[PDB]
Amino acid sequence: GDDRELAILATAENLLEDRPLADISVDDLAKGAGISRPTFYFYFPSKEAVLLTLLDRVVNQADMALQTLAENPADTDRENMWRTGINVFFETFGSHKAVTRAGQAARATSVEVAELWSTFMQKWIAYTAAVIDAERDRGAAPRTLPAHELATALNLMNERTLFASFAGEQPSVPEARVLDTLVHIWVTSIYGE
């Protein structure tokens, strides 16, 4: 039951590493999972539904890691606090590059994917803004931009920049430089002038 579903999901993620979803057939997923095509349709209405489930697993993995960090602050400076948080997304999405790339493309064509994306970005922006507000309340950061608007731009930067790096887009920041680049921009814009 759950094992056949997990096999479909694992087959899809493996296949997505070498071709887009448009070039993956329901028969390809069934074959890789060791099941028939009608048995596949018992577990998933379509191949798009499989991608939705994969993306749901990745974004919840990142969200749960961020929640763990928020409850267990590492004892360190302000720059390291932001780096450890941005690293959650660098490492989680960077460990699932094929699902990340496919989910990014599916947002233009799937309202379900677009709504999942929007839901979690709203959550992560709200958390970012809450941390900025706490830094301002304690006197560590100046009251410059509205914190929620600043948080929105910084999160959109991370989404676009991380995913360009993972996909090797031209142009992009090299993957080995992207964490340092983003941390610099977050720390200077949150604590500067």
Next chain:
Amino acid sequence: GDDRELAILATAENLLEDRPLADISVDDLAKGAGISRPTFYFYFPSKEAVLLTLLDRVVNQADMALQTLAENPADTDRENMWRTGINVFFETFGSHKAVTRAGQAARATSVEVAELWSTFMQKWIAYTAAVIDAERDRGAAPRTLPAHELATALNLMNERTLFASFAGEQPSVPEARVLDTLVHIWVTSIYGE
């Protein structure tokens, strides 16, 4: 000749304001332009080619405006210099929101659109990096990140953030706040710490 082509382009941009390219037919473009379907195919091989031409016109409009600014520096402070430059993209793309949104979506499906996008982003990143380097050479900005990597992240932020605002995405920065938001992040990250 050129007038029929301009009529096709104007019809396409008008139609894109209320439905995506997928819901615009070649017959719709021909009808709006006052021509037959075979006459359309004399000017454009497809509706995707029409969008490519529209997007080419918009990005060259922005590029030419930036070139004009680069030759005619406004006499003002460093924050205003960056604001005037970012405003080129805010105003040019914001005046062609339907073409911008359609071109953004077409990048996932059109190598021609993706290559046009990449070509101009590389050009604008190189210019950004050259200005950062000049500010460092004159002692106004500190030597922090590699200027080209900083410029890449800041340009990707602007692309993602401006276009989310224009499309009214959730989440997004309100359009009336997005210029101030981006300028703050550029100025603090270029001149800070």
